[PDB]
Design an enzyme around this catalytic site. Structure first.
Site, PDB file in Angstrom:
ATOM      1  N   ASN A   9     -31.028  38.254 -42.696  1.00 41.31           N
ATOM      2  CA  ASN A   9     -32.089  38.004 -43.664  1.00 41.31           C
ATOM      3  C   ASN A   9     -32.859  36.708 -43.425  1.00 41.31           C
ATOM      4  OD1 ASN A   9     -33.483  38.726 -46.249  1.00 41.31           O
ATOM      5  ND2 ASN A   9     -32.371  36.952 -47.017  1.00 41.31           N
ATOM      6  N   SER A  44     -38.220  38.470 -48.773  1.00 40.14           N
ATOM      7  CA  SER A  44     -37.576  38.233 -47.498  1.00 40.14           C
ATOM      8  C   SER A  44     -37.441  39.573 -46.765  1.00 40.14           C
ATOM      9  CB  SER A  44     -36.213  37.572 -47.681  1.00 40.14           C
ATOM     10  OG  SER A  44     -35.312  38.439 -48.334  1.00 40.14           O
ATOM     11  N   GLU A  90     -25.957  49.237 -41.656  1.00 45.10           N
ATOM     12  CA  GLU A  90     -27.081  48.327 -41.801  1.00 45.10           C
ATOM     13  C   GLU A  90     -28.314  48.842 -41.075  1.00 45.10           C
ATOM     14  OE1 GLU A  90     -27.452  45.996 -43.767  1.00 45.10           O
ATOM     15  OE2 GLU A  90     -25.463  45.259 -44.299  1.00 45.10           O
ATOM     16  N   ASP A 145     -34.923  41.750 -43.734  1.00 43.36           N
ATOM     17  CA  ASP A 145     -33.708  41.868 -42.908  1.00 43.36           C
ATOM     18  C   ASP A 145     -34.090  42.396 -41.530  1.00 43.36           C
ATOM     19  OD1 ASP A 145     -32.232  41.153 -45.143  1.00 43.36           O
ATOM     20  OD2 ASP A 145     -31.378  43.141 -45.448  1.00 43.36           O
ATOM     21  N   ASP A 150     -19.563  31.289 -43.226  1.00 47.20           N
ATOM     22  CA  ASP A 150     -20.179  30.446 -44.249  1.00 47.20           C
ATOM     23  C   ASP A 150     -19.459  30.437 -45.607  1.00 47.20           C
ATOM     24  OD1 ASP A 150     -22.972  31.251 -46.309  1.00 47.20           O
ATOM     25  OD2 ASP A 150     -21.294  32.604 -45.827  1.00 47.20           O
ATOM     26  N   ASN A 201     -36.786  43.046 -48.462  1.00 46.44           N
ATOM     27  CA  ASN A 201     -36.000  42.825 -49.668  1.00 46.44           C
ATOM     28  C   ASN A 201     -36.920  42.621 -50.861  1.00 46.44           C
ATOM     29  OD1 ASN A 201     -33.512  42.781 -48.101  1.00 46.44           O
ATOM     30  ND2 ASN A 201     -34.064  40.698 -47.480  1.00 46.44           N
ATOM     31  N   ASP A 245     -37.097  40.204 -53.010  1.00 41.15           N
ATOM     32  CA  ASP A 245     -37.570  38.817 -53.132  1.00 41.15           C
ATOM     33  C   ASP A 245     -38.638  38.383 -52.102  1.00 41.15           C
ATOM     34  OD1 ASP A 245     -36.054  38.539 -50.841  1.00 41.15           O
ATOM     35  OD2 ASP A 245     -34.727  36.984 -51.608  1.00 41.15           O
TER      36      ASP A 245
HETATM   37 RH   LIG Z   1     -31.659  43.363 -47.607  1.00 42.48          RH
HETATM   38 RH   LIG Z   2     -31.827  41.888 -52.589  1.00 40.24          RH
END
Ligand SMILES: [Rh+3]
Ligand SMILES: [Rh+3]
Ligand SMILES: [Cl-]
Ligand SMILES: [Cl-]
Ligand SMILES: [Cl-]
Ligand SMILES: [Cl-]
Ligand code: NA
Ligand SMILES: [Rh+3]
Ligand SMILES: [Rh+3]
Ligand SMILES: [Rh+3]
Ligand SMILES: [Rh+3]
Ligand SMILES: [Rh+3]
Ligand SMILES: [Rh+3]
Ligand SMILES: [Rh+3]
Ligand SMILES: [Rh+3]
EC number: 3.2.1.17
Length: 129
Positions: free
Chosen positions: A59, A50, A35, A52, A101, A46, A48
């Site tokens: 995220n 967002s 990561e 990380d 989750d 990302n 969209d």
């Molecule tokens: Rh990502």
């Molecule tokens: Rh993605």
């Protein structure tokens, strides 16, 4: 801060990740490697909109507030910047919520694609744990 492998293993263990929700420490170290390359300051945008954050690339779509992810949630009740600290407490605490989750560590795509079903014990070999 860029952690050493065993240094990160020790910190993750102290913070209670070893066997958390049944995931051995090597799973968590392997996830962090792919990561963030063990870099607490890692950030990645990302598609969209967002972002990380941190050693486990948590995220902003769901988990933290960064002020620039419209419609998103802040389920760990933290600024995303807290996830970039040299102290991994906030990342670990939030990771515990994520892994609980429903989908376990499949929440981390790099874990699913690069760690799941591999010899993850290799990631903590040699460490004084
Ligand atoms: Rh990502
Ligand atoms: Rh993605
Ligand atoms: Cl390494
Ligand atoms: Cl392991
Ligand atoms: Cl936001
Ligand atoms: Cl699970
Ligand atoms: Na958010
Ligand atoms: Rh162990
Ligand atoms: Rh154990
Ligand atoms: Rh906000
Ligand atoms: Rh805000
Ligand atoms: Rh704030
Ligand atoms: Rh501390
Ligand atoms: Rh610490
Ligand atoms: Rh082995």
């Amino acid at each position: 801060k860029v952690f050493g492998r065993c240094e990160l293993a020790a910190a993750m263990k102290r913070h209670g990740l070893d066997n958390y929700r049944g995931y051995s420490l090597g799973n968590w170290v392997c996830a962090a490697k792919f990561e963030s390359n063990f870099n607490t300051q890692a950030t990645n945008r990302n598609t969209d909109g967002s972002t990380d954050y941190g050693i486990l690339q948590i995220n902003s779509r769901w988990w933290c507030n960064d002020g620039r992810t419209p419609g998103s949630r802040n389920l760990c009740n933290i600024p995303c910047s807290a996830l970039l600290s040299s102290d991994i407490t906030a990342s670990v605490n939030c990771a515990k919520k994520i892994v609980s989750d429903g989908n376990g560590m499949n929440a981390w795509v790099a874990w699913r694609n690069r760690c799941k079903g591999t010899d993850v014990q290799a990631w903590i070999r040699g460490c004084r744990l």
